[PDB]
Design a protein around this ligand. Structure first.
Ligand SMILES: [Zn+2]
Ligand SMILES: [Zn+2]
Ligand SMILES: [Zn+2]
Ligand SMILES: [Zn+2]
Ligand SMILES: [Zn+2]
Ligand SMILES: [Zn+2]
Ligand SMILES: [Zn+2]
Ligand SMILES: [Zn+2]
Length: 404
């Protein structure tokens, strides 16, 4: 099981492309796209390359020899009009060759390669190497020095729709400069969006009849007296069970190793400069599961309350956002009864340069400035928008009854 072009093992799909075993063919995605001859004579429904063109490219590749390993089968040809250096994709990667991922998908040797006129990489929280080949500089703000591997990983994880400058959120000059420097910016969706778990936390709604005497839990009829109706006050708590004509109701209560290193650094920074008086730490010996405490911000209906949160970091932190959820119940339009948080920075607008401290600051701001137009709990959003006094009274009552 080796690539038809580079004659190599699949190894790392992030460095050689997804190894595909379709149509009795076995070829790397990067080897496939970066091949100079391949014309894409087919519709996208292998990524638009027919098997026949792949066979022709392999036959033409056997005609040429690699410049690193003197072995036949090389297909990628330095596109300089004068240079005749052909090679194997892994070879070229090892010896310093660069491959572009825009337009013609043209590669270049070490001699002929795009170059920049050129502390630590903020993404990996490590000292940047002295090899200028594996370091890339922003053209835009910071012009920061970044490890090439870190930028790529940010590119693979955060898709084209979300690949941007970690600081100024540049989406025109920064992606173009990265493309010119041989960074693959695939046109997909973000990795945290693609994973099968997705964000089911945010998409669950309360389905439970709380009456001690029910007319029946699992299944509520869509319509009729056997339908579901939710509390207008909290929304956290059948219609014929409610025993009031269909003709509003209120409930009785209402009447890997890089990730670990980054996490240790962020923990120390949080210890040195806490956002809102927040003390945070790992659960047991698991550094990827934290417990945190937030002292309710002054000038909010939550002032004086101490709210506890759970934080789970993904294995590819900070390239994917951490999962953050409230453990203490709170009356807020963007936090549901299970403690899930509808905060944009935990799903979208994520930048690997963001720290848990910034997340906690964003949560404090959300507590003080909710977003009722994108509500997780529509009833609370409606109360917030229509009757601010009632919202503040109930939030204050809940803070006194729970929280503090
Ligand atoms: Zn290959
Ligand atoms: Zn080779
Ligand atoms: Zn060349
Ligand atoms: Zn910038
Ligand atoms: Zn780095
Ligand atoms: Zn797109
Ligand atoms: Zn209620
Ligand atoms: Zn019922």
């Amino acid at each position: 099981p080796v690539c038809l072009l580079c004659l190599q093992e699949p190894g790392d799909p992030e460095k050689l492309g997804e190894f595909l075993q379709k149509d009795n063919l076995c070829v790397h995605y990067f080897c496939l796209i970066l091949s100079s001859r391949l014309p894409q004579k087919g519709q996208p429904n292998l990524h638009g390359f027919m098997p026949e063109d792949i066979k022709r490219e392999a036959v033409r590749a056997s005609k040429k020899i690699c410049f690193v390993c003197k072995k036949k089968g090389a297909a990628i040809r330095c596109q300089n009009d004068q240079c005749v250096q052909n090679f194997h994709l892994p070879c070229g990667q090892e010896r310093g060759c660069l491959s572009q991922f825009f337009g013609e998908y043209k590669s270049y040797c070490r001699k002929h390669r795009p170059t920049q006129n050129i502390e630590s990489c903020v993404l990996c929280c490590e000292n940047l190497s002295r090899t200028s080949v594996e370091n890339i500089q922003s053209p835009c703000c910071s012009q920061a020095i970044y490890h090439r591997k870190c930028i790529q990983k940010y590119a693979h994880t955060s898709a084209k729709h979300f690949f941007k400058c970690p600081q100024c959120n540049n989406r025109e000059e920064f992606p173009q400069e990265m493309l010119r420097m041989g960074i693959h910016i695939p046109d997909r969706d973000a990795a945290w969006e693609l994973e099968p778990g997705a964000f089911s936390e945010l998409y669950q709604r309360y389905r439970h009849c709380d009456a001690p005497i029910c007319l029946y839990r699992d299944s509520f009829e869509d319509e009729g007296r056997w339908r579901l109706i939710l509390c207008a006050t909290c929304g956290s708590h059948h219609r014929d069970c409610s025993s009031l004509r269909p003709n509003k109701w209120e409930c009785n209560e209402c009447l890997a190793s890089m990730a670990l290193k980054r996490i240790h650094k962020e923990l120390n920074d949080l210890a040195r400069d806490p956002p809102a008086q927040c003390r945070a730490g790992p659960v047991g010996d698991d550094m990827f599961h934290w417990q945190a405490t937030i002292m309710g911000p002054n000038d909010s209906p939550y002032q004086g309350g101490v709210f506890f949160l759970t934080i789970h970091f993904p294995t590819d932190y900070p390239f994917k956002p951490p999962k953050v959820a409230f453990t203490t119940r709170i009356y807020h339009p963007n936090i549901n009864s299970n403690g899930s948080i509808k905060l944009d920075i935990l799903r979208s607008q994520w930048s690997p340069a963001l720290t848990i401290s910034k997340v906690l600051l964003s949560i404090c701001s959300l507590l003080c400035d909710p977003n009722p137009d994108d509500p997780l709990v529509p009833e609370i959003a409606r109360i917030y928008k229509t009757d601010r006094e009632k919202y503040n009274r109930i939030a204050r009552e809940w803070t006194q009854k729970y929280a503090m």
